[PDB]
Amino acid sequence: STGSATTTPIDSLDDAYITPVQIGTPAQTLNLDFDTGSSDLWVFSSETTASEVDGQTIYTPSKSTTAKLLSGATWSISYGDGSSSSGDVYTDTVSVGGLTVTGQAVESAKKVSSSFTEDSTIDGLLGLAFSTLNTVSPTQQKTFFDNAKASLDSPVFTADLGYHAPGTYNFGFIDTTAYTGSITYTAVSTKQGFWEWTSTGYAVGSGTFKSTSIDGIADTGTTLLYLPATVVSAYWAQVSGAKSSSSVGGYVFPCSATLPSFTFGVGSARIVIPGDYIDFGPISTGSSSCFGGIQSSAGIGINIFGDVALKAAFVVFNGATTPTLGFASK
């Protein structure tokens, strides 16, 4: 089997991407944030505290003939940005882009934090990291990808995110028309439950490439590119007027600037992030200070190749017995 679904930016800045997902019978279509940095499939639901729902589409398990309470199971998750959610669990049929999993754990939110409530376009998350991170207790549950794997033509999924445009998540096949040149594969460590890999270095603009190992995670659920302070300082030093602002919470730059590209290494290959991908616009409406798309990972504890980086590539998440990651230009 295979699946193919379009993923669409939620706003003009590509702050996140939503992908339609069919849950239950008859289908209830919710727009979920596919997140390769977590491993829970959770949704706004008929059980979500009413004051914490503001415009989201909800899953109502009582209206699904295939929903079953997973008795005794609860979940609770906290994300890197300090957001959180929790609730109980149903199993139901879940389909993404024509690919159907029966008996998928669908985690129903009873509570969500304010950032989720305020995001009217995101109806929940679909985790695509390794199932060892799944938060369901007392019986940990598998991700959609792990449940689908056996049925897939090939045990892979791919992320092809657009810059200010829709893109695609495919399951079970590699679309050889979706990228240019070759795919370069690189080793993955699953020790922390993430798609963790080591970049071979970076360049700023037309500068020379610096060979240096940068361990980090491929995370579709993180907006920006978070890298070591040394790397990030070298980047922003090439933008006149750029500075790190503790009041704003990161590097800002004059909106009048033209940003240089940023290149990262994947083995001997190179992925180029155009300067425009690094512009996240005015810090507040009408401001001439703009927020940068490359930020320091210092104090996160991990480097994160988020959407800024991933959208510059066609990315293969290879879930074979020994997982790997592949990157191609596009």
> Sign (positive/negative) of CA torsion 62, 67, 68, 70?
negative
* Long-range CB pairs of 275-279, under 8 A, 24+ apart, other chains included: 275/205, 276/163, 277/163, 277/308, 277/311, 277/312, 278/225, 278/308
**What is the rounded distance in angstroms from the CA atom of residue 217 to the CA atom of residue 267?**
15
Count of C-beta atoms within a 10 Å radius of residue 174:
18
**What is the rounded distance in angstroms from the CA atom of residue 211 to the CA atom of residue 159?**
26
Give residue 138's identity as a one-letter amino acid code: P
CB 323 within 8 A of CB 186: no
CA dist 253 to 30, 207, 226, 257, 285, Å?
Answer: 37, 20, 17, 7, 15
Bridge-partner residues for 225, per DSSP? 294, 305
CB 320 within 8 A of CB 155: yes
Q: Class assignment of domain 175-330?
A: mainly beta
Q: Which two tokens stand for residue 104?
A: 């998928």
Q: What b/e string do you get for 88-127 counting C-beta neighbours within 10 Å, with b at 16 or more? A: bbbbbbbbbbebebeebbbbbbbebbeebbebebbbbbbb
**What is the rounded distance in angstroms from the CA atom of residue 195 to the CA atom of residue 128?**
9
Question: Which listed residue (35, 88, 92, 279) is catalytic?
Answer: 35
CB 34 within 8 A of CB 122: no
Question: Which listed residue (85, 86, 108, 199) is catalytic?
Answer: 199
Q: Does the bond joining 166 to the residue before it have cis omega, within 30 degrees of 0?
A: no
Residue with tokens 């639901």: 45
Solving technique for this entry?
X-ray
CATH for 5-174, among 3.90.1150.10, 2.40.70.10, 1.10.3720.10, 3.40.930.10? 2.40.70.10
Domain(s) of CATH 2.40.70.10: residues in the chain: 5-174, 175-330
Tell me which DSSP letter residue 313 carries: S
Q: Which two tokens stand for residue 117?
A: 């409530």
CA-based nearest residue to 168, from 100, 97, 269: 97
Count of C-beta atoms within a 10 Å radius of residue 283:
18
Instruction: Report the chain's terminal Cα–Cα distance, integer Å.
Output: 25
35 is catalytic: yes
CB 242 within 8 A of CB 292: yes
